[PDB]
Write a protein that binds this ligand. Sequence first.
Ligand SMILES: Cc1cccc(Cl)c1NC(=O)c1cnc(Nc2cccc(C(=O)N[C@@H]3CCNCC3(F)F)c2)s1
Length: 290
Amino acid sequence: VLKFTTEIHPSCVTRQKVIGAGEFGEVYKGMLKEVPVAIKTLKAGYTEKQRVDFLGEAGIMGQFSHHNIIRLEGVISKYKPMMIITEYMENGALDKFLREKDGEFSVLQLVGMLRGIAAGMKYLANMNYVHRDLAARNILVNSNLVCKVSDFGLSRVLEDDPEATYTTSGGKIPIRWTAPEAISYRKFTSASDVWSFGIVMWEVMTYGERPYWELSNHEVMKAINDGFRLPTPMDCPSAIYQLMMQCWQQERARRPKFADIVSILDKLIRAPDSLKTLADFDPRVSIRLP
Ligand SMILES: Cc1cccc(Cl)c1NC(=O)c1cnc(Nc2cccc(C(=O)N[C@@H]3CCNCC3(F)F)c2)s1
């Protein structure tokens, strides 16, 4: 897969600002000889596994060509430190973006973000790629408000995400984003990604609220097994809440496919008055005045 990738010479790459970090490398904003890029490094002393996982992310990204999937510019593999270079998403991770922009977008803009995410996910699913870690923290946002799916690879995806925790039976999983069958018996498919997408829908419509609030991981699993689901966000179109609820069907076969999700979101956006009908919000506070 690396043969598809452009090998970039180090002298074309200028790292400027540190935007992400880890123990074995950092992510930078930089310039590529005259365009802005993001640059992820892998420090010397890396293991064979680290090299295979690191370059494997670029290999996977290089197989994709879609508006809603992060674009690979190239790799530096013949010099050290090794680097992966992608387009630069000016607004960063979607979860933090929404929390910093609380209430600043229209309902139509929020639904448009979800349509872009769904289109990227439909592409991945049809390319036989199961994400396993779909969440707003793994979506990136550009200066056109376009949302693109990121975080690709094999074992590195769940291993590197601190939201993914060790379960009781083994399996490092981000519990509150993960479908029941993936938690219970390790069955990760595009239909478990659809469950996760429903959680992403709730994250977007709430401007980055943490799913299930302070419930512990076990409390979340128990609640889901007992039939409870996340309540409607504030100011949420009825059609949007209905859609996220169908993503959370216990029976995998009853969930919409991403093809269905993209179609529904596209129809709602193209007839935007449909989004004015709101699901009832259950208030958690009563304010009474004479
Ligand atoms: C360079 C690269 C290699 C392999 C995979 C990927 Cl997806 C990438 N590209 C990126 O990480 C990025 C592309 N554009 C980015 N823009 C950006 C700008 C400002 C802040 C953030 C941001 O929230 N970045 C996340 C925060 C969590 N840690 C990883 C991070 F990238 F730093 C992102 S990061």
